[PDB]
Design a binder for this molecule. Structure first.
Ligand SMILES: *[C@@H]1O[C@H](CO)[C@@H](O[C@@H]2O[C@H](CO)[C@@H](O[C@@H]3O[C@H](CO)[C@@H](O)[C@H](O[C@@H]4O[C@H](CO)[C@@H](O)[C@H](O)[C@@H]4O)[C@@H]3O)[C@H](O)[C@H]2NC(C)=O)[C@H](O)[C@H]1NC(C)=O
Ligand SMILES: *[C@@H]1O[C@H](CO)[C@@H](O[C@@H]2O[C@H](CO)[C@@H](O[C@@H]3O[C@H](CO)[C@@H](O[C@@H]4O[C@H](CO)[C@@H](O)[C@H](O)[C@@H]4O)[C@H](O)[C@@H]3O)[C@H](O)[C@H]2NC(C)=O)[C@H](O)[C@H]1NC(C)=O
Ligand SMILES: *[C@@H]1O[C@H](CO)[C@@H](O[C@@H]2O[C@H](CO)[C@@H](O[C@@H]3O[C@H](CO)[C@@H](O)[C@H](O)[C@@H]3O)[C@H](O)[C@H]2NC(C)=O)[C@H](O)[C@H]1NC(C)=O
Ligand SMILES: *[C@@H]1O[C@H](CO)[C@@H](O[C@@H]2O[C@H](CO)[C@@H](O[C@@H]3O[C@H](CO)[C@@H](O)[C@H](O)[C@@H]3O)[C@H](O)[C@H]2NC(C)=O)[C@H](O)[C@H]1NC(C)=O
Ligand SMILES: *[C@@H]1O[C@H](CO)[C@@H](O[C@@H]2O[C@H](CO)[C@@H](O)[C@H](O)[C@H]2NC(C)=O)[C@H](O[C@@H]2O[C@@H](C)[C@@H](O)[C@@H](O)[C@@H]2O)[C@H]1NC(C)=O
Ligand SMILES: Nc1ncnc2c1ncn2[C@@H]1O[C@H](COP(=O)(O)OP(=O)(O)NP(=O)(O)O)[C@@H](O)[C@H]1O
Ligand SMILES: *[C@@H]1O[C@H](CO)[C@@H](O[C@@H]2O[C@H](CO)[C@@H](O)[C@H](O)[C@H]2NC(C)=O)[C@H](O)[C@H]1NC(C)=O
Ligand SMILES: *[C@@H]1O[C@H](CO)[C@@H](O[C@@H]2O[C@H](CO)[C@@H](O)[C@H](O)[C@H]2NC(C)=O)[C@H](O)[C@H]1NC(C)=O
Ligand SMILES: *[C@@H]1O[C@H](CO)[C@@H](O)[C@H](O)[C@H]1NC(C)=O
Ligand SMILES: *[C@@H]1O[C@H](CO)[C@@H](O)[C@H](O)[C@H]1NC(C)=O
Ligand SMILES: [Fe+3]
Ligand SMILES: [Fe+3]
Ligand SMILES: [Fe+3]
Ligand SMILES: [Fe+3]
Ligand code: NA
Ligand code: NA
Ligand code: NA
Ligand SMILES: [Zn+2]
Ligand SMILES: [Zn+2]
Ligand SMILES: [Zn+2]
Ligand SMILES: [Zn+2]
Lengths: 423, 425, 426, 424
């Protein structure tokens, strides 16, 4: 047992009567002009209003949202608030206050620049965080990093509350306050991992993504999606596609129908970097969860190659891996073409679900290291995808046992649309 | 277009005010002592009470049920009725009446025998029925069959209403009146196909399976399921498992979680025959929907072989095909072990989605016929799985263009747990 | 005896065109008069709930976003019902609005009121118990033809009488929406719930009180911080209007009772000098039909009305006409014998105005003799007019269906209780 | 002031993991063959199944029920259970059990006899109970009465939890655990009082009767009512009609409509005793809530006389009053007839809301005692309506300052339908 105890300093309750805790934000619209603020109040429902104003302008405005609550087995939640601030300006710092009529707390965020071809952005990559001491040091190596992350693409598995007796949802609240120091100030883009299914019918809890969906909203209707568990956002020069590994994706299902139609919406002249987020990797040579992503691979891989996805980011496997550019899309049951071959139109598959979880690393790998695999290692850490312009983006992996400025693995992503060089 | 016109005789409306229509029955519990009675009233809600009595004794009792309505875009449904009759006795003819308050109508069913190893039973196999003239021929061939089926395992794609403008749900209503002359007297076992999804966000009909799940209910709680789209039923000497090709089946999901624990519950020494139903086939050498069943095969194929399923029935492809007993469960990305090999531990895969649909057949086969494909032919028709004892089952395939008693293909099934011997033709 | 207009009447014709909006009606959507609820129904498919609206002055076309709802009643299924609120309008300007923007649109207009003030003149038409007989149609023709300009209808309950038809056949709600649209699409009607909107029919498994009416006709009840749509307050021009529900609870401690006790405290007679109460069931009524039915709510609310010097209480329910004297009956205490209404110049005038048509029957039988609290009564179909001249004066007038559209069978000058409490008896 | 502390013994938590608490039963159907078993589990949801059996047969049954929860402002309830036991034998002792998965608890009840003309039965009448020490004293006098109550007709106002900051619904839990020692073995027939309204729009709790209606169920569908707040049951020789004082009752409203039909359905030839329960008294000569009962009386009083109601019970006034058979139904606005008169066809109106509340008795009476008032006294206590046969019922009032066997007031009821004799 390596999760931080309940009295740990990261879980300290903010002082004040009905003081907002678990404050977290993510993108509110498709293009970054909106932001959705979320927080929990414990002592009474409280106001869902959010006071915000820009850094040097100070015209204080108010946005109204909605309160909701949920129960899980024995656990009754605090009063959860979700509020969307809209029509914000690009490249502008804002302040926002929350808990307006009782104990107010103020936070900050900087909206991204407007969607554009040559607009740089620094995305952090954090996967399978949990709330162990390893979870805390990874969040630390991230906030201290010289390259300065502006949004965290989170590839799934958040709290691991479901590891506790009856999924002790108090450990949802503790994870909420723990991550607040990062997610209250810059957006985290949510994808749903297996530890968010929380399908526990043996305690009459049979509705999937029950607590995760109540606590973490995404702007899924902005991309015409009919579920929060797959959606799309555009930010700076990135077009980001988030899939649900544990929702349906057969032919005709909504997510399948949505992804087919969203792919051909992508405009690489406006967003050169096509980034796909999912939880379970389609390419992974570790023994843990080996070949689990094969089902989705049969359904979606040829579309990734068809639309030249730059990179696919997954978690689930508690280690780090980086494939070569390969595709396994020629198999026809009896023709023998069942081996991945080098394909300059294929994405790079990176597994970055090594932020700590409950404190265990996946170290047993299939040996020998297959040819489709570039780099792999079982160490805790996080990733950084730093878009420079339309042709270059520098990815880097930071180990938890290294200094915050040390890159144990780094590659130049050459854009599949504007600069498809061998990499 | 080849669908029967609206004023066809198999579409006409039962006479009398608020006369029940679209009456269908299905097994209402795990072991076959219950039945779900389902019908619709068009003129007013009416009673959901069901009067029933055995022909032998004959004390007439009432079952209290539930009624529901729904809307699909600019369509408003009539009044759907669902009522479960329980504590029935085995191997007994029962009469039952609906429309008790105005226009009553009488039908009957025969409860199956109690489950035992050697209990014989005839299952009809229908898939992708629709409401074409081809569909009517198949229904007629099934009910004139000399081997007399006692239950229809239906492997998906029912009315094809989703092909009419705005999915004109009136063609759900017509399909109920059409298929009533069979499913009102014997239970059909329902699988959700791809034409039941009806995900239509352009007219904000985004709740998958909404019309199908309103009209056709299913005893999914009896097997501890949390969804109607996957469940199990025991009936005579068989254990049937119905799966949802178009629901989540990833590791850790409800259907995935439900299936692996249901397979552990199967006692072959009590139900010898293990049958699995899905809409999209895992083995399919027809070009239509080629390799669509791969994503499920990657997850469930090894389970079918380890628990030694007897037969997997599917549709989706609008033709017939019987497979050899093969498995493809040794693939490891880089090892090249990706060809189906003979496997006497594996089930036989039958595609049986040639009941008629909207009148087109799938004849573009991948050539040459692959080694995993025993028999295939592009003809409309149905199939029959005839269980004799714990060891033998006779599967035959009847064509619409042949006589009702002619079998153009037949294979004797050796039970995987009681007669583990090669049964290839 | 069946005096209801047949369905092929010209008042019931369907607006042509694929999914033409119909049953278009408007009512105030705020407290002060800067908002409009635009209500309509589409029969062919859902369609857009969006309203295009602009003023004849500026001309800027803006869009308001609304909400789509449907309902069933027995074997009836409704069309696609739309409610959209237009907000932040300018006062005293004429607005055009368009609805049905995705296929065939239809244009109407309204004139927002002046904003509330002490001497703002305004004309209120008074229609009750309308229904859809031919008599109903003569009344609506007369109000439209009135020489002085009715700017808003205050409706004191009982709209379509669809509940008289077998299974309440709510085709007769659609019929009524189309029938009245010719007036309510261009000036707001302020709705009161009557007994015919209850539609409590357990014998056909239909136990939701007020449902068809509540789905089709919305009110700005949250603007007055009311918890229910059946009691609410609005302010228009120099008038503060309090709509009560005769067929909801009103015991001490109930929401209606609680809400009303507080709402009187908010009245500002120096902003809205005219204090108007609407309720379906009359507290004063000397007809045999529904005699003394108002006695229960009179015991709870009469004293408050007098305490706050209410100017008038308009009611329907009785299918005829009556205007009370300024009387009160608030001194009863079981054993003190004081159960006679007395002259009370602080009390409102009670006017019964439920004679617009209904299913075509008048309530002609009366309590004899005419009691002292009754100042004028007649069993005639007609409609009324409350024309505010200023803070001291307001002219009420009753007009019969059998007279010229300018002939006032009854007419009285209302002297304002807060600003000019002169005796204004018959 | 006088509300019993949380550490009191009446509020103690039954021991054991997830032990059922606040157990309380009530008539489950129209005739007495059913019983609604209700309890709250605090540690986890638990099973809503009830295991029951009769002493005559001792064959144990399982009855499945429902589970529910609610929030109120800033309070989150435990897991409320409601299960209906049916087709019970008449006049039979049944044992029932709750908490079947972890901590099991066992209780017992005796079903009433089949409804009949001369079937005796002894009802207790508690009103405005509360949580004070005066409340515990009334409950003691009830359970110690040599007359032995068999069911409680409770004329409303249960916990008074709405007198606490934001109605602190922990005070509903305590009241549940305190009244259990009577209501777990004996059915209480629930009337809704004004302290159940809990209309607190300022903390966005605007659903009237929310905490009450979740915690206490009534067989209101058995008499074709569409609302828990008005309903009727038959029990032994009594037809009992429960009315909702704080709901709509205008002409055409549901409760008005339901009451109109229900009085026409009374068969005095089988249940000759016509009992009506409301919270607000139609007859009251006390200062407190004087004349508040007027509105409903102007609506329902003539019906009560026309159908020969035997007695109407009410609380709300924290005292005791017994009216004469009196009527005030001749008023026609201008005829001056607004003075109650003797009327042997009218019911007796009793105020019995003196069970304790929060400990404040309503002492101030209007003087002198009007003619319609036969007896009145401001003392804490309870009442008993003891049916002997179709002819006779002996009502008696017990004061908490007297012994448990002393009747400070008592009177013999002659049945209005079967014995229209002056019962002065
Ligand atoms: C419905 O219920 C009524 C009250 O419960 C009942 O009226 C009572 O009837 C009893 C008789 O059962 C009355 O008691 C008798 O009255 C005189 C009074 O002095 C006594 O002498 C008499 O002595 C008894 O005599 C019996 C032999 O004849 C024998 O049991 C003993 O000797 C015993 O001492 C009784 O005590 C009582 O006063 C009545 N109460 C009233 C009128 O309030 C109704 O009759 C009953 N209806 C029926 C039974 O149909
Ligand atoms: C389980 O059930 C299966 C049923 O498919 C059994 O396998 C079948 O067994 C039957 C015999 O019961 C056999 O058919 C018979 O072949 C006989 C050849 O002589 C013919 O019978 C003749 O006609 C008369 C009727 O029995 C009789 O009077 C006469 O003496 C003569 O025998 C006739 O052709 C029968 O149909 C099938 O060939 C066989 N099917 C196979 C092997 O696939 C199986 O044996 C049963 N198991 C147990 C333990 O009972
Ligand atoms: C549900 O919506 C569909 C789609 O609108 C309705 O079908 C359509 O109904 C119209 C009648 O209003 C049909 O009219 C066609 O259009 C021209 C006008 O340009 C008309 O003059 C022609 O005679 C022609 O028929 C249209 O064909 C039809 N479309 C279909 C059936 O695909 C349908 O009636 C609605 N159903 C319900 C139950 O509301
Ligand atoms: C509340 O009740 C449930 C069931 O009524 C308790 O759990 C059940 O009981 C035991 C564990 O308590 C589980 O199996 C048993 O293990 C014990 C060893 O402790 C042994 O004697 C037997 O071999 C027996 O199989 C059982 O699976 C379990 N079931 C479930 C669904 O939990 C539960 O512990 C109770 N909670 C408490 C007391 O807090
Ligand atoms: C996009 O960013 C890349 C990295 O920032 C550019 O490549 C780098 O440019 C540096 C000049 O600032 C140079 O020293 C590096 O050698 C070079 N290559 C690296 C870091 O791998 C990239 O391309 C450059 O841009 C133009 C203006 C010229 O300098 C070229 O010679 C370079 O290739 C940038 N591309 C664009 C379109 O901005
Ligand atoms: N007509 C009236 N007669 C007496 N008191 C009245 C009357 N109208 C209003 N009141 C007030 O209502 C208050 C009653 O307190 P209240 O909260 O309404 O119920 P309560 O005192 O708790 N009695 P109860 O409802 O049985 O618990 C009294 O103290 C009076 O000030
Ligand atoms: C939710 O229910 C659980 C039961 O599983 C409670 O945890 C147990 O409580 C009992 C006594 O209350 C202890 O003996 C156990 O050791 C506890 N832990 C277990 C069983 O893992 C828990 O307290 C409840 N939570 C809330 C918020 O009420
Ligand atoms: C309020 O309006 C009334 C009615 O219009 C005014 O009284 C009238 O005053 C005019 C003079 O302009 C006279 O000719 C009429 O005879 C009056 N009518 C009546 C019925 O007396 C009154 O002056 C106005 N009060 C104001 C403006 O304060
Ligand atoms: C988590 O890390 C921060 C530094 O990043 C430290 O201040 C804090 O005490 C740590 N909390 C733990 C280890 O519980
Ligand atoms: C209704 O009223 C109008 C008068 O404005 C008229 O056009 C119509 O013919 C009248 N009668 C009927 C039956 O519609
Ligand atoms: Fe993980
Ligand atoms: Fe098909
Ligand atoms: Fe009327
Ligand atoms: Fe009280
Ligand atoms: Na996975
Ligand atoms: Na077919
Ligand atoms: Na309360
Ligand atoms: Zn995972
Ligand atoms: Zn298909
Ligand atoms: Zn009326
Ligand atoms: Zn009270």
């Amino acid at each position: 047992n390596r999760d931080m105890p309940l009295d740990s300093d990261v879980f300290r309750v903010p002082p004040g009567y009905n003081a907002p805790q678990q404050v977290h934000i993510t993108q509110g619209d498709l293009v970054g002009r909106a932001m959705i603020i979320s927080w929990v109040t414990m002592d009474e429902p409280g106001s869902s209003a959010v006071r915000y104003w820009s850094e040097k302008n100070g015209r204080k405005r108010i946005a109204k949202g909605k309160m909701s609550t949920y129960r899980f087995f024995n656990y009754s939640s605090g009063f959860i608030h979700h509020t969307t601030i809209r029509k914000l300006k690009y490249n502008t710092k804002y302040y926002y206050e929350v808990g307006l009529r009782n104990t107010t707390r103020r936070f900050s965020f900087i909206t991204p620049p407007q969607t554009g071809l040559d607009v740089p952005y620094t995305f952090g990559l954090i996967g399978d965080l949990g709330q162990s001491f390893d979870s805390n040091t990874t969040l630390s190596h991230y906030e201290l990093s010289p390259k300065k992350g502006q949004t965290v693409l989170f590839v799934g598995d958040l709290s691991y509350a479901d590891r506790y007796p009856n999924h002790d949802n108090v450990r949802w609240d503790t994870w909420g306050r723990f991550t607040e120091r990062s997610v209250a100030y810059q957006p985290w883009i949510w994808t749903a991992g297996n530890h968010e299914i929380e399908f526990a019918p043996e305690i009459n809890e049979t509705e999937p993504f029950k607590p995760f969906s109540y606590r973490y909203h995404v702007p899924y209707e902005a991309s015409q999606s009919t579920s929060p568990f797959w959606y799309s956002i555009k930010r700076a020069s990135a077009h980001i596609i988030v899939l649900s590994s544990y929702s349906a994706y057969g032919r005709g299902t909504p997510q399948y129908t949505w992804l087919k139609k969203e792919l051909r919406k992508v405009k690489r002249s406006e967003t050169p970097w096509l980034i796909v987020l999912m939880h379970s990797p389609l390419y992974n040579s570790y023994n843990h969860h080996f070949m689990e992503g094969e089902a989705m691979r049969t359904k979606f891989e040829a579309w990734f190659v068809k639309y030249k996805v730059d990179v696919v980011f997954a978690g689930h496997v508690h280690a780090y891996e980086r494939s070569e550019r390969v595709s396994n899309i020629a198999y026809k049951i009896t023709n023998g073409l069942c081996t991945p071959v080098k394909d300059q139109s294929a994405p790079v598959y990176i597994t970055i679900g090594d932020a700590g979880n409950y404190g265990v690393i996946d170290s047993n790998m299939i040996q020998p290291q297959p040819e489709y695999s570039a780099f792999r290692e079982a160490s805790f850490g996080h990733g950084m995808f730093d878009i420079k312009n339309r042709t270059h983006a520098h990815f880097s992996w930071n180990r938890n046992q290294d200094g915050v400025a040390v890159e144990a693995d780094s590659v130049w992503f050459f854009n599949r649309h504007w600069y498809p060089v061998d990499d």
